[PDB]
Write a protein that binds this ligand. Sequence first.
Ligand SMILES: Cc1cc2nc3c(=O)[nH]c(=O)nc-3n(C[C@H](O)[C@H](O)[C@H](O)COP(=O)(O)O)c2cc1C
Ligand SMILES: C[As](C)(=O)[O-]
Ligand SMILES: [Zn+2]
Ligand SMILES: [Zn+2]
Ligand SMILES: [Zn+2]
Length: 118
Amino acid sequence: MLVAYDSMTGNVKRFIHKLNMPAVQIGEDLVIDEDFILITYTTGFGNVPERVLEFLERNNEKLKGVSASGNRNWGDMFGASADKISAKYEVPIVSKFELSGTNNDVEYFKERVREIAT
Ligand SMILES: Cc1cc2nc3c(=O)[nH]c(=O)nc-3n(C[C@H](O)[C@H](O)[C@H](O)COP(=O)(O)O)c2cc1C
Ligand SMILES: C[As](C)(=O)[O-]
Ligand SMILES: [Zn+2]
Ligand SMILES: [Zn+2]
Ligand SMILES: [Zn+2]
């Protein structure tokens, strides 16, 4: 499955490169015409980044699941971008991981996406 992602300081980008799955960085101009999983980071106080919000305003039809990178210092706001997107668009939260993730976070994401893709 295609992974769409956004990264501001490189942590989600690093995670993407550990997955070895088809992936595309989201942009203002991007239209995704096939099923995809979104990986986002969390910004502000528990929020979805603006670039991800504007992309999802336009591309949510094919969204099948969302993961968030985040930081457990944020307590109940940890990965809350994924909670928001999941609730709004009624798609599963695939996973939450800290920063660029661990090897287990990588395998877990892949195994959960293989499930959702069936
Ligand atoms: C200003 C700021 C606010 C943040 N807010 C949250 C947050 O609410 N929840 C969370 O889990 N992580 C939060 N984070 C942690 C980032 O999501 C985390 O560093 C993420 O790995 C950044 O991804 P990126 O390097 O791909 O941009 C915040 C980080 C910054 C700098
Ligand atoms: C988003 As890419 C072209 O570094 O896999
Ligand atoms: Zn690359
Ligand atoms: Zn806007
Ligand atoms: Zn707008």
